[PDB]
Design a protein around this ligand. Structure first.
Ligand SMILES: [K+]
Ligand SMILES: [K+]
Ligand SMILES: [K+]
Ligand SMILES: [K+]
Ligand SMILES: [K+]
Ligand SMILES: [K+]
Ligand SMILES: [K+]
Ligand SMILES: [K+]
Ligand SMILES: [K+]
Ligand SMILES: [K+]
Ligand SMILES: [K+]
Ligand SMILES: [Mg+2]
Ligand SMILES: [Mg+2]
Ligand SMILES: [Mg+2]
Ligand SMILES: [Mg+2]
Ligand SMILES: [Mg+2]
Ligand SMILES: [Mg+2]
Ligand SMILES: [Mg+2]
Ligand SMILES: [Mg+2]
Lengths: 170, 156, 217, 92, 176
RNA sequence: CAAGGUAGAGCAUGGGCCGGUAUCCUUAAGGAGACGGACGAACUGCGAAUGUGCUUUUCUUCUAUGCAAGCGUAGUGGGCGAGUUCUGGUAAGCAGGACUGGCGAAGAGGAAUGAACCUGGCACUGUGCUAAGGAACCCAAUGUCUGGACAGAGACCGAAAGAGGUAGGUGAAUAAAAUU
């Protein structure tokens, strides 16, 4: 599970509201504290305001509707840190929410490249129509052309030992 | 192995700064000193009489006695896990007036007014203490002029 | 003979240099640092290729000499004498020591074991860090695949990791190719052999004029 | 406010009798006298009584003697003087 | 207030609170003497002790030194009430006692019931020292359901020590 | 409010490596060079973090079941180890220093076993809860989801150098399915 938040904040010195600007940042994280942490990280690297001179005025959660659980196609732009350097790339996913899309990327890179979730950075999330799809993976499922049978058996009962003449699986 | 002369290990200490060689300036000689002032030691390598031992360089103490061209200053030091007072003789070319009491003296000047009024009108002074910086203040913000931030820099 | 390379690989000790304090040091094996067409103007050899370090260690003067011979022989046979310039960037200033001991040990009048153990000079090495340029080439743009293969042969003469990489720079200038052309046209560059000086609006006017009549265009 | 309250408490507790001290003498007339003072202390705050009770518990060497003239010298114009010890003659 | 402010396209952010709450999560027995002295000055002595501290620049530098041992943050009124009612107690000098009407009236001449105490503690800044130094440190249990990760990591890393901000109430509510 | 010259950064006095265009000096060689690259424990033009001292309770916070001059008298004066760093040595369970906690003089639960590692400091009983580490069976508590991986491999385990198989990223082409 992963959530989406938008954080707002200003600069202060020995006195208040020293600049009339307000800064904003949308972030995918698990909770508000991990959200606030990211806001501090970006401010210090793109500007030079350290925490002691900042104040957060607001944090809000962003939520969709999707009462019917309709399935949508999304494209995601990302980078991650390896032992060598920083690696950029783009991949496409299907799901019922932007957060559902984002949790699947994080799982993928951990599986394929052996990276902990805190070393992955999301740059952009975009919802796409059928003509926009670039890579091969999801297109068959998007064009609604897939059926398959079950490969995994399923247990009939919670009992550990059963009679030879009973039905065992599904 | 090392040696134990009076000026051991003073190659960095006891050397003049870049473009600051030569004898002291007139202000050094025209400064008047009094018993009870706080004073600060900084050795001038060009003057060879009245030099203190290099342990005392950069330390601050209190004037105990005043002579023609030298001063006696009181210091404290730890030896064999006990505190010992030490009385150091220094020539006036190797000392400067210390700034360490500056703020306290200003505060005393304010207290000296209040403590008189406190006998006439009140009974006890308000005494004007310092306080450490408190929590972050409250703010009311107009909310036009929003600036967005993003991980646009890819950092190849 | 010599001890194996593993004895002196890592940078354990502080730098130690030939000086009034350290005498009786032997000469390093490498003596020649530039090969090919040394004085060729900066414009004439645009492509730049480097061997780059992915390690922090010491390189012996014996290894540097072996690499020089290897890289040079290849370029000379393939590029021709007038088409390339090679530079070996690192100089072996650090002195290694040995605490020499007898084979017929156990009992002697000589002070045996770890008594009075400080060593005598043994040889020399260069000290190297991550991301440093160890060997550099400039050539014609036709000779990319040749220059790559020349530098590959050095990679087997040194301990640790090293990579062959191509540069953004024009020649042995420090300038990116795009920017170089933009300064060359518009008259701002003066040739100084393997590199360039940039003209600026800084001095007296009669000097500015005298510089500009000398520009590359 | 609080720093004063604290210090004024410490100063008081430094005067009062300890109540876990007892004189080492096996003299029953001396132990009688201590019992009286002890029962007075637990019903008063007066500093003179507390000082007297603490001094009856100290050793023979701690109860050092005084000569008559030195009492007068220290009496500082008072009429009654009190002393937990022995008063000796001054031949001078 | 929030209605009036939004109706004129403006945001209001209140002043930071006057006190933090601190809980001692892990054992101090091998820490340096400088750390041990700092814990003493905050009155923390055994694991799962909890204590209230003035928000101030001196306190914030003390916390920076001990942050690897303690969870800290800010506490809203509802949780402050559950703490004082379920685990509070007091002292005069060396006598430990239950919070009762007689004992309040004795110590603070104008506070007479336990509800007035909580009100002054939350809303009056200038009496905090007197009001705080009357309460003993709170003695809590370990949290019900345990800790989710290695508690010695920072909260950002998924452990239990550091600054939990507005969310310390969740840790304390499992420990009352 | 003082003092400091280490890490980084630099090569302006001193030591010191390689190559130089115009120009200059001679030769008809070489030399100098308006500059670039490479450097020092006993080179410095600049300079941290951490640590040290001074004043102020007229400055937060704690504090009496606490500190304690003075007097009398014991044992000790072979140490060893962890983390961070340093010197000598090819190194060493090697020899020798510095800083903050240990074992010595420290039990209990955990790393199968271990002086020093992780949790965490012990009077004597009873009921609850957690840590570190575990949860097919030995042995108190275990299952779920998504990717990889076929080697008598891995969970415990060695280098420079490499091809093969498979999973992904980025950049070049070509394209009458794609392919390199
Ligand atoms: K000697
Ligand atoms: K051998
Ligand atoms: K032997
Ligand atoms: K230099
Ligand atoms: K140095
Ligand atoms: K002895
Ligand atoms: K022993
Ligand atoms: K111990
Ligand atoms: K065991
Ligand atoms: K062992
Ligand atoms: K079982
Ligand atoms: Mg020294
Ligand atoms: Mg003389
Ligand atoms: Mg060494
Ligand atoms: Mg520990
Ligand atoms: Mg847990
Ligand atoms: Mg350095
Ligand atoms: Mg000995
Ligand atoms: Mg043990």
């Amino acid at each position: 599970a992963i959530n989406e938040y938008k954080v707002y904040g200003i600069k202060i010195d020995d006195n208040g509201v020293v600049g009339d600007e307000v800064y904003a940042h949308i972030v995918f994280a698990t909770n508000e504290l991990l959200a606030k942490s990211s806001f501090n990280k970006i401010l210090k690297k793109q500007k030079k305001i350290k925490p002691k001179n900042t104040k957060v005025i607001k944090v809000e959660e962003i939520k969709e509707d999707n009462k019917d659980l309709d399935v949508k196609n999304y494209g995601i732009d990302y980078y991650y840190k390896s032992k060598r350097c920083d690696h950029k790339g783009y991949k496409e996913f299907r799901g019922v929410s932007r957060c559902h899309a984002v949790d699947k990327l994080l799982c993928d890179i951990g599986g394929r490249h052996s990276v902990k979730r805190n070393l992955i950075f999301i740059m952009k999330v975009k919802e796409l129509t059928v003509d926009e799809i670039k890579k091969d993976k999801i297109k068959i499922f998007a064009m609604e052309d897939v059926e398959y049978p079950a490969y995994r058996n399923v247990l009939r009962s919670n009992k550990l030992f059963v009679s030879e003449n009973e039905k065992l699986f599904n | 192995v090392s040696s134990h002369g009076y000026r051991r290990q003073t190659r960095n200490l006891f050397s003049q700064a870049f473009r600051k060689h030569g004898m002291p300036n007139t202000s050094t000689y025209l400064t008047q000193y009094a018993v009870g002032e706080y004073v600060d030691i900084k050795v001038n390598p060009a003057i060879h009489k009245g030099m203190p031992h290099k342990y005392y360089h950069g330390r601050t103490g209190i004037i105990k006695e005043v002579n023609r061209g030298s001063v006696i200053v009181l210091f404290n030091r730890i030896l064999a896990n006990k505190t010992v007072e030490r009385k150091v003789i220094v020539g006036i070319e190797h000392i400067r007036k210390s700034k360490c009491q500056d703020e306290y003296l200003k505060r005393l000047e304010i207290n000296k007014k209040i403590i008189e009024e406190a006998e006439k009108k009140g009974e006890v002074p308000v005494l004007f203490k310092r306080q450490p910086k408190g929590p972050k203040p409250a703010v009311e913000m107009l909310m036009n002029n929003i600036i967005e931030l993003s991980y646009d820099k890819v950092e190849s | 003979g010599r001890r194996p390379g593993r004895c002196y690989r890592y940078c354990k000790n502080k730098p130690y240099i030939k000086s009034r304090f350290c005498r009786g040091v032997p000469d390093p094996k490498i003596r020649i640092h530039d090969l090919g067409n040394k004085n060729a103007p900066c414009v004439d050899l645009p492509l730049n290729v480097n061997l780059i370090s992915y390690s922090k260690e010491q390189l012996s003067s014996e290894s540097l000499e072996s690499a020089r011979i290897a890289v040079n022989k290849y370029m000379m046979v393939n590029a021709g004498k007038d088409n390339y310039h090679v530079r070996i960037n690192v100089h072996p200033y650090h002195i290694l020591r040995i605490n020499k001991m007898l084979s017929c040990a156990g009992a002697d009048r000589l002070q045996t074991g770890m008594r009075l153990a400080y060593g005598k000079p043994y040889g020399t090495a260069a000290r190297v860090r991550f991301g440093q340029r160890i060997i550099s080439i400039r050539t014609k743009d036709s000779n990319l695949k040749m220059a790559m293969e020349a530098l590959r042969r050095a990679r087997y003469k040194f301990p640790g990791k090293y990579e062959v990489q191509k540069s953004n720079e024009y020649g042995f200038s420090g300038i990116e190719r795009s920017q170089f052309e933009e300064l060359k046209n518009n008259g701002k560059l003066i040739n100084m052999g393997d590199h360039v000086k940039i003209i600026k609006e800084k001095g007296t006017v009669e000097r500015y004029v005298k510089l500009c009549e000398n520009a590359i265009q | 406010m609080l720093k004063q309250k604290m210090f004024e408490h410490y100063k008081k507790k430094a005067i009062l009798f300890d109540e876990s001290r007892v004189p080492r003498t096996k003299n029953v007339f001396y132990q009688s006298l201590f019992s009286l003072y002890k029962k007075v202390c637990e019903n008063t705050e007066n500093e003179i009584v507390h000082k007297i009770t603490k001094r009856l518990t100290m050793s023979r060497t701690e109860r050092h003697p005084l000569k008559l003239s030195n009492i007068i010298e220290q009496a500082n114009g008072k009429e009654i003087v009190v002393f937990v010890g022995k008063v000796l003659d001054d031949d001078k | 207030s929030e209605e009036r402010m939004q109706k004129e396209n403006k945001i209001y952010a209140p002043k930071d609170p006057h006190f933090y709450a601190v809980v001692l999560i892990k054992s101090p027995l091998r820490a340096s003497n400088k750390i041990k002295k700092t814990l003493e000055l905050f009155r923390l002595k055994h694991i799962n002790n909890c204590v209230l501290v003035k928000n101030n620049e001196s306190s914030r530098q003390m916390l920076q030194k001990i942050r690897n041992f303690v969870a800290y943050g800010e506490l809203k009124l509802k949780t402050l009430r559950e703490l004082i009612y379920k685990r509070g107690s007091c002292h005069i000098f060396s006598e430990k006692l239950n919070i009762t009407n007689e004992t309040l009236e004795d110590a603070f001449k104008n506070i007479r019931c336990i509800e007035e105490f909580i009100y002054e503690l939350y809303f009056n800044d200038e009496r905090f020292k007197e009001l705080n130094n009357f309460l003993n440190p709170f003695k809590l249990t370990p949290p019900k359901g345990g800790y989710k990760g290695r508690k010695a990591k920072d909260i950002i890393e998924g452990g239990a020590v550091g600054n939990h901000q507005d969310k310390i109430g969740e840790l304390i509510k499992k420990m009352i």
